[PDB]
Amino acid sequence: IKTVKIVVDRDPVPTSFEKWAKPGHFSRTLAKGPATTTWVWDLHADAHDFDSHTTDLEDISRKVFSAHFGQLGVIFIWLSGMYFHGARFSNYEAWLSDPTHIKPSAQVVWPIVGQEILNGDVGGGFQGVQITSGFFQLWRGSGITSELQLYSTAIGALICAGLMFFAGWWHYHKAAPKLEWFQNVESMMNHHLAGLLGLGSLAWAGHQIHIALPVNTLLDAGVDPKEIPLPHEFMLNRALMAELYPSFAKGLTPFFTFNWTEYSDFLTFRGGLNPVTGGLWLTDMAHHHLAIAVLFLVAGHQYRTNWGIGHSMKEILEAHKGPFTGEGHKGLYEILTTSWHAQLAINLALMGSLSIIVSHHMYSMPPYPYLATDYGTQLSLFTHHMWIGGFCICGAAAHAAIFMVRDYDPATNYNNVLDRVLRHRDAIISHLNWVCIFLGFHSFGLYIHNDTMSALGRPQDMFSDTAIQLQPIFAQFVQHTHALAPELTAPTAAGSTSASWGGDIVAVGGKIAMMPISLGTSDFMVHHIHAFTIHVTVLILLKGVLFARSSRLIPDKANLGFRFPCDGPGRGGTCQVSAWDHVFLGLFWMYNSISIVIFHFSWKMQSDVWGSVTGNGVSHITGGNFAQSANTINGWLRDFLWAQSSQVIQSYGSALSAYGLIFLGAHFIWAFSLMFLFSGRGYWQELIESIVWAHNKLKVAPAIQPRALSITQGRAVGVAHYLLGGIATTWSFFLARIIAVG
Amino acid sequence: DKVQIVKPINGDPFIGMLETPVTSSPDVANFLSNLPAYRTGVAPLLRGVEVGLAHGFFVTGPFIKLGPLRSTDAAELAGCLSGAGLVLILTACLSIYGATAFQREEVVGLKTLSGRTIAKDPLQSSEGWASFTSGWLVGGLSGVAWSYVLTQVLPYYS
Amino acid sequence: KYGDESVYFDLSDVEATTGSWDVYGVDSASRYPEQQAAFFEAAAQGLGRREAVYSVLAVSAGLLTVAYGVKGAKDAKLPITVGPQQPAQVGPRDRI
Amino acid sequence: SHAVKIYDTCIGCTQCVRACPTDVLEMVPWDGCKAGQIASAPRTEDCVGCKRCEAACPTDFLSVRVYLGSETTRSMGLAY
Amino acid sequence: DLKFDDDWKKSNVAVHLASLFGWVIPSASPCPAFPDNASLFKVFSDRISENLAHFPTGPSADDPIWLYMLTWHMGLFACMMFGQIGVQARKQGYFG
Amino acid sequence: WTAPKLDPNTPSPIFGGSTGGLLRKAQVEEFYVLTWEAKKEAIFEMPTGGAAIMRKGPNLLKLARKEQCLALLNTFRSKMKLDGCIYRVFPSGEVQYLHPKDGVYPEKVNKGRVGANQNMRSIGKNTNPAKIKFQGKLGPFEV
Amino acid sequence: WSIGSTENMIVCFNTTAILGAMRFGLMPSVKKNFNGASSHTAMVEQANAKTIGSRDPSGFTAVDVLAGGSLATIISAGEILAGQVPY
Numbered sequence A: 001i002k003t004v005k006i007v008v009d010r011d012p013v014p015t016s017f018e019k020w021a022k023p024g025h026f027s028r029t030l031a032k033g034p035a036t037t038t039w040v041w042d043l044h045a046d047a048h049d050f051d052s053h054t055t056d057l058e059d060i061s062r063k064v065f066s067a068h069f070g071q072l073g074v075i076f077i078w079l080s081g082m083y084f085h086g087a088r089f090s091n092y093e094a095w096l097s098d099p100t101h102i103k104p105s106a107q108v109v110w111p112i113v114g115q116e117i118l119n120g121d122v123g124g125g126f127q128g129v130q131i132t133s134g135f136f137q138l139w140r141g142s143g144i145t146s147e148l149q150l151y152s153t154a155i156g157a158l159i160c161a162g163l164m165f166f167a168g169w170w171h172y173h174k175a176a177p178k179l180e181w182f183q184n185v186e187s188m189m190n191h192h193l194a195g196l197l198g199l200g201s202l203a204w205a206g207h208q209i210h211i212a213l214p215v216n217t218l219l220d221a222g223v224d225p226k227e228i229p230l231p232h233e234f235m236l237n238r239a240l241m242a243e244l245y246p247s248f249a250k251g252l253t254p255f256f257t258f259n260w261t262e263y264s265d266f267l268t269f270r271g272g273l274n275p276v277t278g279g280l281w282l283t284d285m286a287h288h289h290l291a292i293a294v295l296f297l298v299a300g301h302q303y304r305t306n307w308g309i310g311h312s313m314k315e316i317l318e319a320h321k322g323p324f325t326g327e328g329h330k331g332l333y334e335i336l337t338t339s340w341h342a343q344l345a346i347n348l349a350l351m352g353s354l355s356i357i358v359s360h361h362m363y364s365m366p367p368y369p370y371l372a373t374d375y376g377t378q379l380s381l382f383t384h385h386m387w388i389g390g391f392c393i394c395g396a397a398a399h400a401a402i403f404m405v406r407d408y409d410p411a412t413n414y415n416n417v418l419d420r421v422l423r424h425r426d427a428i429i430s431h432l433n434w435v436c437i438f439l440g441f442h443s444f445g446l447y448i449h450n451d452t453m454s455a456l457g458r459p460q461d462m463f464s465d466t467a468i469q470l471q472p473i474f475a476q477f478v479q480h481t482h483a484l485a486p487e488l489t490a491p492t493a494a495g496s497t498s499a500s501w502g503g504d505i506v507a508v509g510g511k512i513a514m515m516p517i518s519l520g521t522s523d524f525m526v527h528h529i530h531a532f533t534i535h536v537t538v539l540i541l542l543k544g545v546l547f548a549r550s551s552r553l554i555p556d557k558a559n560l561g562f563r564f565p566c567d568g569p570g571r572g573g574t575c576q577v578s579a580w581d582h583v584f585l586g587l588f589w590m591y592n593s594i595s596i597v598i599f600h601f602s603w604k605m606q607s608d609v610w611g612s613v614t615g616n617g618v619s620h621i622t623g624g625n626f627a628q629s630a631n632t633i634n635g636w637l638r639d640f641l642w643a644q645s646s647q648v649i650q651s652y653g654s655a656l657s658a659y660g661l662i663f664l665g666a667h668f669i670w671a672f673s674l675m676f677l678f679s680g681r682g683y684w685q686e687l688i689e690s691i692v693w694a695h696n697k698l699k700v701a702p703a704i705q706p707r708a709l710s711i712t713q714g715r716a717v718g719v720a721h722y723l724l725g726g727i728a729t730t731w732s733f734f735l736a737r738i739i740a741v742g
Numbered sequence B: 001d002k003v004q005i006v007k008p009i010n011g012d013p014f015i016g017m018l019e020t021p022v023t024s025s026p027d028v029a030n031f032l033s034n035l036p037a038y039r040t041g042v043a044p045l046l047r048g049v050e051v052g053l054a055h056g057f058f059v060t061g062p063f064i065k066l067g068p069l070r071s072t073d074a075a076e077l078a079g080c081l082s083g084a085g086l087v088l089i090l091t092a093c094l095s096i097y098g099a100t101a102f103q104r105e106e107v108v109g110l111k112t113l114s115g116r117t118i119a120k121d122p123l124q125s126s127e128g129w130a131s132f133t134s135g136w137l138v139g140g141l142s143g144v145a146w147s148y149v150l151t152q153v154l155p156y157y158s
Numbered sequence C: 001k002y003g004d005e006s007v008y009f010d011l012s013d014v015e016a017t018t019g020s021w022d023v024y025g026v027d028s029a030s031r032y033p034e035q036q037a038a039f040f041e042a043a044a045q046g047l048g049r050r051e052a053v054y055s056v057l058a059v060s061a062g063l064l065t066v067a068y069g070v071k072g073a074k075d076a077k078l079p080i081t082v083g084p085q086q087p088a089q090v091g092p093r094d095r096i
Numbered sequence D: 001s002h003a004v005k006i007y008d009t010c011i012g013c014t015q016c017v018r019a020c021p022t023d024v025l026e027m028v029p030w031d032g033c034k035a036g037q038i039a040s041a042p043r044t045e046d047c048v049g050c051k052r053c054e055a056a057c058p059t060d061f062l063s064v065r066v067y068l069g070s071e072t073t074r075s076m077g078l079a080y
Numbered sequence E: 001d002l003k004f005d006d007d008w009k010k011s012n013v014a015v016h017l018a019s020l021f022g023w024v025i026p027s028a029s030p031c032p033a034f035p036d037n038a039s040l041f042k043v044f045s046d047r048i049s050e051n052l053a054h055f056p057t058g059p060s061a062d063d064p065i066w067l068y069m070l071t072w073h074m075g076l077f078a079c080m081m082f083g084q085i086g087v088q089a090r091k092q093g094y095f096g
Numbered sequence F: 001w002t003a004p005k006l007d008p009n010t011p012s013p014i015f016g017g018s019t020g021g022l023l024r025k026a027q028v029e030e031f032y033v034l035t036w037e038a039k040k041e042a043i044f045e046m047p048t049g050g051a052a053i054m055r056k057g058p059n060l061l062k063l064a065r066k067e068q069c070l071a072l073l074n075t076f077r078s079k080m081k082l083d084g085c086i087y088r089v090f091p092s093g094e095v096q097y098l099h100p101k102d103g104v105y106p107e108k109v110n111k112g113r114v115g116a117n118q119n120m121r122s123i124g125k126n127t128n129p130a131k132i133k134f135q136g137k138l139g140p141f142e143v
Numbered sequence G: 001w002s003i004g005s006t007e008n009m010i011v012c013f014n015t016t017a018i019l020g021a022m023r024f025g026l027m028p029s030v031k032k033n034f035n036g037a038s039s040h041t042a043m044v045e046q047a048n049a050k051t052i053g054s055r056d057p058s059g060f061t062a063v064d065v066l067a068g069g070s071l072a073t074i075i076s077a078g079e080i081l082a083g084q085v086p087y
């Protein structure tokens, strides 16, 4: 039972540019110098492969910690930039007065080559590139009413970025912690729950209560942002705050006497949306963050660090074992306290799932004022966080495989929960593959059969709502229970969590903030498609992880490495056997799945939720054609791809001409990726030989010998350009469409 | 005292199988062992009979209730003729499998999990598979006809 | 011996060494009623031969296709057998 | 099975033999090289064709070459 | 040994009865959230009676029987699974 | 090395079982046996998947492929510095001494080995395939 | 709220009961809890936290006091806020 304490080596590495002058210092093969042009790609590929640089885990941990400091400095630079642009290059103050009709914009282009046309008529006597990041909605929900506040926090963010870089330099060059510092996971959880999430949520609840809540209440009442009292005048002047919310006239006495019901005016459980702004009630969000803060503060006292109270996570792992799982979770504490890649796999998986949940929960329960009404930012946020989630999950698989090849020790995992998974990986993969086939056959024939029947002129034999009812009865049941939650199972809630469950469509300024979402047969089919695509991505990734060390084809695959191209053309051909290549295909399917998720989201919202109420029912964007057309591949091709592409392809001569140019360019990059994907190194190397002959003819032969990309690098470039082109095509399409239609 | 359930196949941990509550449970084992395919001492023809009857009986139903003529009054007759046609196709598949599959000696024997040496299944031979195919054909056509009869006869059918 | 402790190789017990185990098979000689067995033996008397089944399926294929093209298709009221029974339409450039 | 051929440029560095995952290659005495040994491929039937020997051969051009031919069970590397 | 144990279930009648009835009784206790302080088992049985009058006609998609069925069966099965786990673990050396 | 070592019934390594073991190919066609002498009890990695404990003294292990046996033996030699031999076992019940096939590991030159599949020429001195046209030749390499 | 009120008496009773429980080994404490114990019915002395600094003859610590007070305040909050929910 080691005592948790602070441990450091003083001045472990001097601060010097001698390593900057020498590329590839971190390695041994790259340190000697470039013999061939492969060396550049090798340098960049293993730039952040700290495990392959040094054997000792202490130096790796220090490198990771200071690299995290550098990333956080980069993120703070990005935030400083966004706030600074929102201050000197935006119409945030104009948008504040008319958020329903002024398009948010925080980027203005220089008028050089005729690109000034990209400065669109976004309103407010302003021109610029309309933004979809939702930053304006975030600032309004945070209570920012002036550009000076944006400038002030931007400068703060820049200072914090400098501090983050200084902290990384300090914790690598001056005060690098020892390995026993990083391995204090109990303390880590205690702090990252109570102090990062707990105290962070408490701080944000306090901000929301004292700054965002009064300012946004005045904005809701119709008060001009330039007439609202400043935030310090609300936080400090208790009479001013109590004028808006009379519970503040009682001070902290109800808080400290457990008379918390007196705070019910500014700490509510209303549920639903603000009818004026179309966002979540800010009293609800303040109460939310308060309870989250309390829950995390309590949960951060779970683990024992230096005083006997608390848990030891090793013990609670090892005590969980059973008749089917052998020794159970024994040895996993060693895995996750002596392998960075294992932790990275778990954390990336959970981060990716979380980003996905974030997208779902933000479209369905818009947390910001005038966010739902701005359809472009809502679609953009959903699609963005979906893509981030899918990428993070693919990385989680990759780092799981990396751990499995490199840091997995059979001695410390004899009969534990991991070794038994490795002992029936054949059953897992075969059942998953069977599931994957089943799912694909059924779901695709649900679309292909419909295509065939429609083409044969047999709509009564289709799987549409009219012909054959494949109703998602279970999802409709969940919708019903959630719409009736505020009456029986959530009695203190004044309303449902989202209006998507049912009843009382929410409209702000004509356009619909939120509308109950129905689920017909097209929703059934597309959701089973989603499950199919997820299950195939999981098949690929889990097969890569489980067969990372060995297989019946290659038993000695662990020593071949995590990232090797093949084992040769023998055994019939051993291409793409490495778990890295599984992440390649895994990445591909991930992309494919997300492409369907975001297409379903965009079409369903344009057809059945988004629109404008005019007193004579809803006028949706596409007119509700999803329910009757999204049961056929032809329907998606025609009524979603072909129909909604008119905005992006006819965007030339307007501010969306940039989106049209990116649409074409991303198409090109995707097709360009097909070059790297469909070809192989041998051809390109021979072409290089001919070109090198041509150069040697004129004595232009480089000292660094030209080489074709490695096979792994060729696959890497292919998947990277494919993902770039596909996603940027969808990005340009979605943004141009949703900005033009509004 | 710390009982482990999942065990290797027949106690040999070097064969590609594991005995689990799905594979070696007494109820599962008794159900599967009592199915006609696993009655190796019985004549292949009669095992094929029951097989065909069960299979041809159920396989008709999808064609009845989801076929092109499901709405028409002739839905049942169409579905049963579809089922009979599928039985004929499966008879062709069985005949070709029986002609091609059993061409090797298979010198290695077979034993039970208790270690009792037992003779090979007569079904697992060319002539035995031919007899099984004939039993399949008779059983499948009888089962399809029975499904037709029951759709025309059964009181609560709709 | 195969039954020894930690021994799973035996050149005398090749079946246990190689894993060729009858998992669920049962060698009971009779399960069905004998007369039911006799009926279904007689029902498949000539079909026990593979080439007899080949002749059966060839004849069945011919009879089913002939009957379908002569009588079966019309009886099922296929739309293809029913005539168009509608006025025709002219393509662009007045091309019928 | 495949065909594996050893050529007289072999220096007897043994790397082909050490790289073979199926024990196809072996070192035999030979007066042609300084090291006093040449590789050979007696167990050619076991050659899966993975070409690890060619990857591990330092001599330019390769002294060991694998020519993929008739595919058998062992050459296909099947556990079934 | 390494042979599969045919008594893997360890099905104990006392476990079955304890889990079933020690979920039924708490689920038959008064619950002030439900109307008339009715229990989850009470409202579930009421919905069963109302839907069993129309035996062929299934319950409507909006009828409360589904939520009661889920929220009762979860607790039941939780009691069954945890009761088996706890009994077989106490019998073994997992606890003492 | 007067005679190849015979194959006794030696204890197998402790293993909980796996789905990666012998398939029907062991029954119909062949399977391979790896036997090695262990200096001490230790945990090694199965080439099929999972972790097993080898017993002190001789051990016997049956695997589907020669490649699996040789990979595991190479692990034992390079990490644990053990000695092992491989047999091929047919369904008829005749084993077959395989590794090293001489009593000497192939990487070490041993007297008595005869060169097989050796072309006493460089790779470029092979004739063109057009010269061996319409001949029962595998290729330029076999002439 | 006042001295002798129901909420004050609830919280005072909760903190007294909790501190007494973990002072006399009835509740897990700094110097005796389930870390490295055997079964549910027996706690064990924690050598890592043994003699961590106290002047109380049973070895009651300040962290014991803080933990018992936090848990008591948590429980008192739960009990008092029952009956304050709107419904």
Ligand code: CLA
Pocket (backbone or CB within 6 Å): A064, A065, A068, A069, A072, A181, A182, A184, A185, A187, A188, A191, A192, A194, A195, A196
């Ligand atoms: C109350 C205590 C506390 C808090 C708030 C944090 C917060 C954080 N830690 Mg953790 N950490 C703690 C205690 C704490 N730690 C303890 C006790 C240990 C030792 C066991 C560690 C060991 C640890 C490791 C090994 C790593 C982190 C990382 C991180 C950062 C993750 C990025 C993120 O979520 O951005 C949230 C971003 C913000 C909250 C913005 C402000 C950023 C600053 C840095 C917050 C200040 C926190 C600091 C503890 C207080 C200043 C102390 C300083 C003056 C000495 C996050 C800033 C990772 C990281 O990114 O490294 C930099 C990482 O690799 N921590």
Ligand code: CLA
Pocket (backbone or CB within 6 Å): A202, A203, A204, A205, A206, A207, A209, A210, A234, A235, A236, A237, A238, A241, A247, A248, A249, A250, A251, A252, A255, A263, A290
């Ligand atoms: C982290 C989040 C956060 C923060 C910072 C605050 C902060 C504040 N709240 Mg809010 N509040 C929060 C969350 C938060 N709240 C939540 C979650 C709720 C819901 C229950 C409330 C509900 C609430 C109500 C209902 C009220 C407040 C009030 C207040 C103010 C009273 C502070 C005070 O005097 O108490 C005591 C604070 C101290 C004793 C600390 C001061 C110590 C100083 C800094 C020490 C410095 C000494 C230094 C060493 C040397 C001096 C010299 C040096 C400077 C040179 C303060 C601005 C009151 C108010 O006036 O609001 C308008 C009020 O009525 N809060």
Ligand code: CLA
Pocket (backbone or CB within 6 Å): A044, A045, A046, A047, A048, A049, A050, A344, A348, A391, A392, A393, A394, A395, A396, A398, A399, A402, A563, A580, A583, A587, A720, A724
């Ligand atoms: C928390 C996140 C995280 C962290 C810390 C790491 C860290 C690491 N990863 Mg993991 N990974 C992640 C996320 C993460 N990755 C995700 C999300 C994926 C899925 C894509 C992967 C997939 C992955 C694979 C497949 C591999 C790694 C590898 C590595 C290691 C070396 C990386 C390196 O030096 O390359 C430096 C970085 C690069 C060479 C990337 C260059 C930029 C690419 C092309 C994308 C740029 C796209 C851009 C946004 C579009 C615009 C471009 C514009 C200029 C035109 C290092 C341990 C490698 C390894 O050996 O592991 C041990 C390895 O093989 N990772």
Ligand code: CLA
Pocket (backbone or CB within 6 Å): A433, A434, A436, A437, A438, A439, A440, A441, A442, A444, A445, A448, A536, A539, A540, A585, A586, A588, A589
């Ligand atoms: C549209 C193109 C396409 C199609 C149809 C498939 C189809 C398939 N892929 Mg491939 N794949 C593709 C593109 C495609 N992939 C591309 C471009 C990539 C990137 C490299 C991948 C990468 C890839 C990997 C890495 C994996 C797959 C897997 C799969 C299977 C998933 C199971 C499934 O779909 O159910 C079954 C098949 C279908 C539904 C396919 C369509 C068939 C329709 C419904 C017709 C049905 C029968 C029809 C009536 C014909 C009978 C009559 C005929 C004889 C005349 C399936 C074979 C996974 C796999 O094999 O495991 C299951 C897998 O691991 N694929």
Ligand code: CLA
Pocket (backbone or CB within 6 Å): A441, A442, A443, A444, A445, A446, A448, A449, A452, A461, A462, B059, B062, B063, B066, B067, B068
């Ligand atoms: C898998 C996806 C899928 C599904 C669900 C359907 C479904 C259907 N099609 Mg479509 N179709 C599809 C793909 C699919 N099709 C594709 C890809 C094509 C090619 C273009 C077509 C072309 C097509 C045509 C041309 C026609 C249909 C028709 C039909 C219907 C009747 C088919 C029939 O007779 O089945 C017979 C079914 C079976 C013999 C068996 C089905 C499987 C059973 C139920 C599985 C049960 C397993 C069980 C759960 C396991 C239990 C184990 C336990 C004992 C232990 C039905 C609605 C016909 C129609 O008009 O009807 C509307 C028709 O004319 N289909």
Ligand SMILES: CC1=C(/C=C/C(C)=C/C=C/C(C)=C/C=C/C=C(C)/C=C/C=C(C)/C=C/C2=C(C)CCCC2(C)C)C(C)(C)CCC1
Pocket (backbone or CB within 6 Å): A294, A298, G015, G065, G066, G067, G068, G069, G070, G073, G074, G077
């Ligand atoms: C007998 C004796 C004595 C006396 C004693 C006593 C009487 C003690 C006490 C103690 C106490 C009396 C303590 C207390 C503590 C407390 C605490 C530590 C608290 C805490 C709290 C918390 C942590 C909270 C949290 C929260 C909040 C803030 C809000 C929300 C909710 C909750 C609740 C969660 C003397 C010394 C004279 C001498 C010796 C003997």
Ligand SMILES: CC1=C(C/C=C(\C)CCC[C@H](C)CCC[C@H](C)CCCC(C)C)C(=O)c2ccccc2C1=O
Pocket (backbone or CB within 6 Å): A675, A676, A677, A679, A680, A681, A684, A685, A707, A708, A709, A710, A711, A713, A714, A715
């Ligand atoms: C195109 C292609 C190549 C050929 C690509 C070559 C080798 C490299 C790509 C070109 C870069 C741009 C060369 C770097 C140029 C220098 C950095 C010079 C400075 C640039 C000035 C021109 C400005 C492969 O090597 C390959 C390998 C495996 C699978 C697919 C492929 C593949 O598709």
Ligand code: SF4
Pocket (backbone or CB within 6 Å): D009, D010, D011, D012, D013, D014, D015, D016, D017, D038, D039, D056, D057, D058, D059, D062, D063, D064
């Ligand atoms: S073949 Fe290449 S590797 Fe094998 S010995 Fe001769 S030279 Fe060394």
Ligand code: SF4
Pocket (backbone or CB within 6 Å): A570, D004, D019, D020, D021, D022, D023, D024, D025, D046, D047, D048, D049, D050, D051, D052, D053, D054, D066
């Ligand atoms: S190909 Fe693979 S197996 Fe055949 S020799 Fe070269 S290395 Fe040994």
